[PDB]
Amino acid sequence: RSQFKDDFSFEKRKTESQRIREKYPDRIPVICEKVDKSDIAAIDKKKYLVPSDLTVGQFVYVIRKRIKLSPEKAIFIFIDEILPPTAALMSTIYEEHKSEDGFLYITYSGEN
Amino acid sequence: LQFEIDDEMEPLYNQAKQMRYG
């Protein structure tokens, strides 16, 4: 389960996602947390506003640069416990996978 | 609840937009 969902009730989350989407219609509100029992690095930022025209692969690149992962290591990103295709658009992914509160929940692991 | 545009991220986004893969 997500920590963000445990920290804030549905009302707060829905209000926030609606406000975000109304203020930045070109951006996608993403919550990105580390797999609980994984090994690799975890950072401070989990709240992202990533451009809708970005692909999944480009986003993966972005977070690799953010966490400063070593170029030899893998990083597997899960959405609803499945691995999304790298060539897929973030807008498509969002329309298909957005949560009831209007956020897109993303998990990542070093091993999978 | 602290959801704002990060200036520490925008350059990365603009960098990634040019970085196409397969």
Side-chain angles (χ1 to χ4, degrees), chain A residues 43 45-62:
Chain A
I43 61 275
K45 179 77 86 59
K46 68 176 183 182
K47 297 167 285 187
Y48 293 88
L49 281 180
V50 9
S52 58
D53 51 330
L54 227 67
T55 67
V56 163
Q58 292 166 331
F59 176 63
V60 166
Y61 160 79
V62 165

Side-chain angles (χ1 to χ4, degrees), chain A residues 4 8 12 16 19-20 24 27 45 47-49 53-54 58 61-62 66 103, chain B residues 1 3-6 8-10 12-13 15-19 21-22:
Chain A
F4 181 80
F8 303 100
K12 299 166 179 49
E16 186 61 37
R19 165 196 162 271
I20 278 296
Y24 312 105
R27 291 300 174 98
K45 179 77 86 59
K47 297 167 285 187
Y48 293 88
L49 281 180
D53 51 330
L54 227 67
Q58 292 166 331
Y61 160 79
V62 165
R66 173 60 197 217
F103 282 108
Chain B
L1 32 150
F3 246 98
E4 74 280 6
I5 290 186
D6 196 353
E8 200 181 354
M9 294 297 299
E10 296 290 313
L12 285 190
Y13 289 143
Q15 287 176 232
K17 271 175 182 174
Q18 312 172 4
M19 190 107 173
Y21 302 95

